[PDB]
Design a protein around this ligand. Structure first.
Ligand SMILES: Nc1ncnc2c1ncn2[C@@H]1O[C@H](COP(=O)(O)OP(=O)(O)O)[C@@H](O)[C@H]1O
Ligand SMILES: Nc1ncnc2c1ncn2[C@@H]1O[C@H](COP(=O)(O)OP(=O)(O)O)[C@@H](O)[C@H]1O
Ligand SMILES: [Mg+2]
Ligand SMILES: [Mg+2]
Lengths: 375, 73, 219, 375
């Protein structure tokens, strides 16, 4: 089938499956991490109509399905559904046999270890890969940045990290994990669109709210004067055509969605915000690291494609950090993919080929071997 | 025998990035010869798994020439 | 296209040339196929000192006419190129100007037409002509780590020579595009990767030109 | 590699490696005597990142290292780490082969003799120098002064001597050795900056405290009225920008650091102070020497670059010594280097070339030969 030993870089952070080959620019198979299930009976005889719809095919039929993300906040909930996602990933979209290729998974730090361990157990026992590795999402986000020094903000669909790394060495004590991410912003956006007058309650309607969040939101550099501006005039009211008919027109909801990311008191989650978890992750580091963390602050995962979020980020960290510091919020426009791109780089290095957790070494010490080889 | 190699410019001369915008751009150019040089510059043809480098090209070229060589007498 | 004066040779082969002499199975001659191998393309963008580029650049600059170098927009002084030095512009025993007419004559004997070989000289003039493009960091405005070209007059003559619009190629030196199933986006290259992008375009253009030359001789 | 037989003058007193060639003005390789070691794991694959950082390169990465001076109070503690310091000294910074050059080491008097003996053993067995000598630090500090008569105060990072020498003859019975030096002043300065409010506990932070000591301290000619002056107004408060951010402002800590050197009861070390070890070293000498020790009191090592310390020194010895004596505290501003400079002079003399402890004479009587040829 395949005449190569190219490593597979499979990457489900929490909300969007992206996969491909090692040593490649763009991820080959990008599709949402959903499994579908018909919530009512079928009538037409002779249709096919299996009781599983995974990936973008589920979004073709999302009107008649109960959509269900199998992984939540980076934690895999239903292992059978995630096995459907992986089966559709390798066998249908990417269309390659896992038996002949090493695999490079990704996860979050501060993960429940049964996710990592059972993920390795499914990768070796079911799909029978020859090699396997459990990559950290944020470190790979620093691999695609072309740097070896920087603090990493990625903020995927269910997790954000702010992992500081200095000169090839990470700082595991200064690590962070906040559970405020894009799915919570989608639920809050659904709540405030219910406040305006557009009632979205279905999971398919929740997917439409995610579409409105992706297309039509920005970050509000100064939230107070932007709030008074939205209360002032209708220069911020924007119409978005929903699928099948009625258009919407959003005002202050256009920028109160990512302000929740910068201020978690709107969603009532006790936290300090993104800009203070960065500053706290810098202040937990030592004294002689911090200007290298200021000049190389990376903001290159998902949920950062809101326009001007680097201006709010630099404008706020400048207010937090002491003066005469050069706050460089590195936002390369290739983000939302840079964790896969760092997967492609790290899977294509020459030094990495003796760090593979491989079979006959998996079977030697069982599934706990990941906690002694990987990290 | 022993040969001395100066390390100056190795990483400079391994760099062979010929990424997709150069190939699609020179495929877009009106000269028919430059279209005839870059058949992968068509965006209808998916580019591929497509990285650099130079030493990989010379390594695969010495291995390939060695293969076609040793298949004969 | 494949020789250069080195430190210890006046004339040295810097590739391997292979020749198929193909016979019928009963023993009658059929033909033959030239195959090139291992073109030292790194010489094209930078030479060690005391050495020379490939001979076709020196023969092209020293041996062409006024109308041809006006069509190729080539200055004929060797001081006005970043890929050529003035020190090895001339040795004794090898005369480049007569050898250029020898190469164009021999190219006509091996069987190319006038605008075909003239187009080959257009591409060689593009490879040499790419050398005077230099970069600088973008800092007005500064966002974020963007490369900038220095001048446009060289670039617009390259784009006019290759019949391409300038803004596409000016994009193509500074940005690289990451695609997807549904989208593509242009991220920035820095200063150094712009230099290696230009040099890789030069030596890959020259090497693939040389392989197309061997391919077209094979007919 | 080298077309000369120039003698190497390598000088680690206790805290700063300075090395160079014989017959030279400035030492060629000056770098701190530290070895680094990453106290936590590495993450980035393909970095280099060896488990050794020596010299100023360690100060480039001191945020992620546990810094450790291999020599303490002039006594070498870890011989492997000091072998790393010497290997980096000859092979990387000074960049010369030890096989073709004689070497001129330095040490303290009243040294544990295994330091001298094992130092000679490492210099002959490992680096294979043809010749070797164990120079006294203070005597070389009198060689750079251009004199043959004087009492020598140097006060390096871990030791001070007050070696009296009269007309080419030293007085070995009147010799002194006090273990109060600049590293103890660095620890006391760290303690009183903790008293003000700036908490420094890391070895890298201890290096920052050493930087504040070097830049921003003076000697307080009269400590009582200077103490009442610092308690009076804020004309002594001075701000120093720390690396990466927060500035400090020191008051009475600016001059209570070297007063500990003149008064060891602040650090609780039972002693008499510098000014009374000088006077006791003079009073242990005979009667007809002392005005030549008064007119030629040398103060030319490290930890004496505090401004006005010659005024406190002369002003105190004048109070101790009897009247009609000319107390000349010779403080040539080329100090902190004068022990190396005396190494350069003494290694370049014509008479010295039959005092080299050489190989085939080392092998004749073993490593004890230093106790019969050198001193
Ligand atoms: N252009 C965009 N604007 C705003 N939000 C976006 C955009 N693109 C993606 N997102 C959000 O980012 C999340 C996916 O981020 P990503 O890091 O790709 O997830 P994963 O953790 O699966 O890798 C989705 O919830 C989506 O809503
Ligand atoms: N300008 C300065 N002001 C105050 N202290 C200094 C200054 N320069 C160096 N020091 C101190 O002197 C010590 C080094 O003294 P030195 O005699 O060079 O040591 P070594 O014994 O290695 O020769 C260091 O600990 C440093 O704190
Ligand atoms: Mg992600
Ligand atoms: Mg000293």
């Amino acid at each position: 089938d395949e005449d190569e030993t190219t490593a597979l870089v499979c990457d489900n952070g929490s909300g969007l499956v992206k996969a491909g080959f090692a040593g490649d620019d763009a991820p080959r198979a990008v599709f949402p991490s959903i499994v579908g299930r018909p919530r009512h009976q079928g009538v037409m005889v002779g249709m096919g109509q299996k009781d599983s719809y995974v990936g973008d095919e589920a979004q073709s039929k999302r009107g008649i399905l109960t959509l269900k993300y199998p992984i939540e906040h980076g934690i895999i909930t239903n292992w059978d559904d995630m096995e459907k996602i992986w089966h559709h990933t390798f066998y249908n979209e990417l269309r390659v046999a896992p038996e002949e290729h090493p695999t490079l998974l990704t996860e979050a730090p501060l993960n429940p270890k049964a996710n990592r361990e059972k993920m390795t157990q499914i990768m070796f026992e079911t799909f029978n890969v020859p090699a396997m590795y459990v990559a950290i999402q944020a470190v790979l986000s620093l691999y695609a940045s072309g740097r070896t020094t920087g603090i990493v903000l990625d903020s995927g669909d269910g997790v954000t990290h702010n992992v500081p790394i200095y000169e090839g060495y990470a700082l595991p004590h200064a690590i962070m994990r906040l559970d405020l991410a894009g799915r919570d912003l989608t639920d809050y956006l659904m709540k405030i669109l219910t406040e305006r007058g557009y009632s979205f309650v279905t999971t398919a309607e929740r997917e439409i709210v995610r579409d409105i969040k992706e297309k039509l939101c920005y970050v509000a550099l100064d939230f107070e004067n932007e709030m008074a501006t939205a209360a002032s005039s209708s220069s911020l009211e924007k119409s978005y055509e929903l699928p099948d008919g009625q258009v919407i027109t959003i005002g202050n909801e256009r920028f109160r969605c990512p302000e929740t990311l910068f201020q978690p008191s709107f969603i009532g989650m006790e936290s300090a915000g993104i800009h203070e978890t960065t500053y706290n992750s810098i202040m937990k580091c030592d004294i002689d690291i911090r200007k290298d963390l200021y000049a190389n602050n990376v903001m290159s995962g998902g949920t950062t494609m809101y326009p001007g979020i680097a201006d709010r980020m630099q404008k706020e960290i400048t207010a937090l950090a002491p003066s005469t510091m050069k706050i460089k919020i590195i936002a390369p426009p290739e983000r939302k993919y840079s964790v896969w791109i760092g997967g492609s780089i790290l899977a294509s290095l020459s030094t990495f080929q003796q760090m593979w957790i491989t079979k006959q070494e998996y079977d030697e010490a069982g599934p706990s071997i990941v906690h002694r080889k990987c990290f | 025998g022993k040969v001395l190699y100066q390390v100056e410019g190795f990483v400079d001369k391994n760099n062979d990035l010929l990424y997709r915008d150069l190939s699609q751009a020179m495929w877009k150019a009106g000269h028919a010869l430059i279209k005839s040089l870059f058949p992968e510059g068509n965006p209808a043809k998916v580019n591929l798994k497509r990285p650099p480098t130079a030493g990989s090209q010379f390594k695969a070229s010495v291995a390939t020439l060695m293969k076609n060589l040793q298949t004969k007498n | 296209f494949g020789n250069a004066k080195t430190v210890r040779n006046d004339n040295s082969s810097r590739f391997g040339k292979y020749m198929d002499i193909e016979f019928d199975f009963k023993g009658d001659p059929l033909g033959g196929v030239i195959s090139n191998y291992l073109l030292e393309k790194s010489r094209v963008v930078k030479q060690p000192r005391g050495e020379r580029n490939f001979h076709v650049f020196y023969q092209l600059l020293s041996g062409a006419s006024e109308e041809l170098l006006h069509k190729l927009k080539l200055e004929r002084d060797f001081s006005r190129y970043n890929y050529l030095s003035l020190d090895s512009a001339k040795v004794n025993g090898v005369d480049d100007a007569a050898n250029f007419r020898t190469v164009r004559n021999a190219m006509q004997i091996v069987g190319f037409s006038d605008p075909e070989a003239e187009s080959v000289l257009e591409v060689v003039a593009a490879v040499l002509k790419l050398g005077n493009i230099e970069f600088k960091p973008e800092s007005r405005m500064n966002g974020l780590d963007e490369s900038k070209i220095k001048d446009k007059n060289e670039l617009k003559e390259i784009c006019e020579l290759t019949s391409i619009d300038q803004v596409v190629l000016e994009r193509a030196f500074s940005f690289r595009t990451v695609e997807a199933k549904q989208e593509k986006v242009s991220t920035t290259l820095n200063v150094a990767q712009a230099y290696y992008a230009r040099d890789a375009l030069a030596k890959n253009l020259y090497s693939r030109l040389f392989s197309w030359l061997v391919n077209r001789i094979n007919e």
